[PDB]
Amino acid sequence: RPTFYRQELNKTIWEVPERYQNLSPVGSGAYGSVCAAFDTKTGLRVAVKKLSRPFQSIIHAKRTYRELRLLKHMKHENVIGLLDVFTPARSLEEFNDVYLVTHLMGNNICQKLTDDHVQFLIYQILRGLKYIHSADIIHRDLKPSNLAVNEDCELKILDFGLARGYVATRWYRAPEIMLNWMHYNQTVDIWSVGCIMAELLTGRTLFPGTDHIDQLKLILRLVGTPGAELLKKISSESARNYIQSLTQMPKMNFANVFIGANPLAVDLLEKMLVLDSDKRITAAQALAHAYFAQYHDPDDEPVADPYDQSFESRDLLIDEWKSLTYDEVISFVPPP
Numbered sequence: 001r002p003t004f005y006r007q008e009l010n011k012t013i014w015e016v017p018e019r020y021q022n023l024s025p026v027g028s029g030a031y032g033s034v035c036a037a038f039d040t041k042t043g044l045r046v047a048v049k050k051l052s053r054p055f056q057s058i059i060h061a062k063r064t065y066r067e068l069r070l071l072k073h074m075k076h077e078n079v080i081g082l083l084d085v086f087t088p089a090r091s092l093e094e095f096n097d098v099y100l101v102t103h104l105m106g107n108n109i110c111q112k113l114t115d116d117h118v119q120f121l122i123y124q125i126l127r128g129l130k131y132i133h134s135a136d137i138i139h140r141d142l143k144p145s146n147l148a149v150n151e152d153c154e155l156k157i158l159d160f161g162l163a164r165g166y167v168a169t170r171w172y173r174a175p176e177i178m179l180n181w182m183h184y185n186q187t188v189d190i191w192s193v194g195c196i197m198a199e200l201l202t203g204r205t206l207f208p209g210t211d212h213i214d215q216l217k218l219i220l221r222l223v224g225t226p227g228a229e230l231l232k233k234i235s236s237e238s239a240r241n242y243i244q245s246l247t248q249m250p251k252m253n254f255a256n257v258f259i260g261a262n263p264l265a266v267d268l269l270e271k272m273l274v275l276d277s278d279k280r281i282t283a284a285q286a287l288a289h290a291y292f293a294q295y296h297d298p299d300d301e302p303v304a305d306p307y308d309q310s311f312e313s314r315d316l317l318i319d320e321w322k323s324l325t326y327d328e329v330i331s332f333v334p335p336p
């Protein structure tokens with residue numbers, strides 16, 4: 001057991017091994033806080049996430065276990081990976097706190113904004129999402145503040161998950177999940193990618209809605225109102241009656257909206273930003289789109305090892321989720 005030390009940052013106590021130094025706050029929300037730091041065992045910059053009161057409720061405890069399990073499993077160049085996990089506790093009996101560590105990579109709109117760099121950035125997002133989806137995980141939260149990039153334009157997907165330069169989750173959300181239209185699939189995340197790629201091409205947020213009603217209004221102005229075939233798939237009656245009450249909107253010509261852009265970029269956006277999630281392109285199909293010809297390699301776009309989510313079905317007490325989390329802390333082995 002290393003020697004720990006204590007300090008207070010923004011009214012939050014941090015008790016961490018002495019190898020982690022110069023802690024500097026990055027972000028904070030209801031569920032936790034993140035600091036940047038230097039790891040003197042390696043000479044590298046890291047980020048440390050402290051969960052707020054991880055075992056104070058069932059929701060907290062199960063979220064804590066969910067995140068540690070998933071982060072321990074993620075082993076992909078375009079997804080966050082876990083360098084370390086630790087607790088100042090010396091026994092289960094005083095286990096009250098959880099800290100997670102990753103290498104510090106840091107979007108904020110990589111040096112130049114060329115079509116080449118948009119290609120590479122969106123390519124890496126799709127490559128990481130193919131991996132995440134193959135583990136039967138839906139991100140649900142994709143947005144520019146959940147992407148990490150370095151000076152070489154390499155990118156990783158993460159999820160702060162803190163309930164935190166303003167970037168609203170709703171701006172990048174697919175309408176079927178934002179408004180509980182229907183049972184939704186993994187391509188909700190592809191909608192978010194389309195929104196991100198559009199912003200990289202135009203310099204502005206595609207759909208900056210101020211609430212869910214305005215968000216839907218902005219979306220339908222581009223993609224048009226649902227026709228009769230999709231309305232029949234909107235199984236929520238309240239949502240269907242609302243949409244049918246609206247002034248109908250035509251689908252816009254994307255070549256005019258994104259004037260000046262690579263025609264292959266426009267075509268890809270046309271396949272991502274479609275209301276019908278049965279027709280929206282998947283991450284693996286998008287990787288094969290001609291926009292990515294200079295990066296796509298179907299032999300270097302790997303999938304995840306199988307990921308056991310049977311714990312999600314279990315209805316457990318705080319102290320049981322706590323014990324399972326402690327098991328996972330104790331068994332962690334840092335990568336090479």
Ligand SMILES: Cc1ccc(-n2nc(C(C)(C)C)cc2NC(=O)Nc2ccc(OCCN3CCOCC3)c3ccccc23)cc1
Pocket residue numbers: 026034047048049063064066067070071074079080100101102103104105106132137138139148157158159160161
């Ligand atoms: C309940 C819950 C369940 C699962 C998640 N979840 N889901 C995913 C997938 C789906 C993308 C695999 C990833 C995560 N969790 C995260 O991505 N957690 C983290 C976010 C931001 C961080 O640091 C931000 C600072 N940043 C780090 C990179 O370098 C630049 C700075 C982090 C630093 C250390 C450790 C963990 C961090 C989240 C919550």
